Amino acid sequence: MLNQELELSLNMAFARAREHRHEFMTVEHLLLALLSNPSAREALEACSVDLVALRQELEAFIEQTTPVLPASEEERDTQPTLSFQRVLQRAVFHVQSSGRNEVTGANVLVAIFSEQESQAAYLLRKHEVSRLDVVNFISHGT
Template sequence: MRDFRDAKAMAHTLRALLADHGVTISNSQSLELIAKAFGVADWNTLAATIRASSRVEAAKPPATIETPIRPQALRFATELERTLQRALGYSDARRQQYTTLEHFLLALIDDADASRVMLACAVDLAVLRQDLTDYIDNELQAIVVETGASSGGTRLTAAFQRVMQRTEAHAEQMGQQEVTGANVMVVIFAERLSPAVRRLHNQDMTAEDAAYMVERGIAKRDGAAAP
């Protein structure tokens, strides 16, 4: 069964089918009709979604080959898929060449699993959102592409990719069937020099706090993780 990533092929099929019935439409019109069928405003919006989805697939660690003694590769939860697309969208919208951990953490604020961990660790999400937005807008000017350059080509930084690999490993260690934003919040602290991690530390959140919450279900209380 086809999905939105087959949109161009579907538009071609639609155009040919209408032509067989004496109805002639242009290529652009067929693309717009397919976009409407998927419930989005126009073809440009759908095309951006397709590009983001492709980069999300590229962001995932390569699936391991199944053997009789190795479990099947984990799935990414739908919520985390959307979070990755949101992070890519933040850099695309600003015409930035790279999607960084700061873009990712900003997207994780609206991820139900990740935000639950941050709130349990006493993080003020509104303050974190403002700090990250200011950093991305003001400190990442060097990675903005020149005016007139095409957008949609943002790449993941090495730190981003390392976090994704550790995230999957943590989920596997926990015996989960899906990788979620909660796993990200445990492993992101390994990137000690990251401005994203520094902003979590500024709110007194630590890797231990996150691990207590995710692995033991214990929320941080009175400035420290409960014993």
């Protein structure tokens, strides 16, 4: 049910975490991946969000908080955490309820706002991304 561009973003996120040997991937990794997803980026530019500043702070936070695998063996692949899974599950079932067939990066962006205590949500608020604006742009513009 995921559209090509969203599948690409998720694959890129996985491939990035493997390159970095990151032990797990949180909702913050997901948001970082969405900053270059056309659907989610378009929604963010419509809100006049400074994507450069947002990306830099998100990247800093990830590197500073994500454990990195030692040159040792075992668990070579990264694992999505409960926040990463919840957000995707939320988007998928919200789209299914809207009668639409495709899940886009923008739908996933809206779902991230529901992870209220996450650093991802904190940074969206910090950078003045109103969920109301995002939702209005999606309902009408897509």
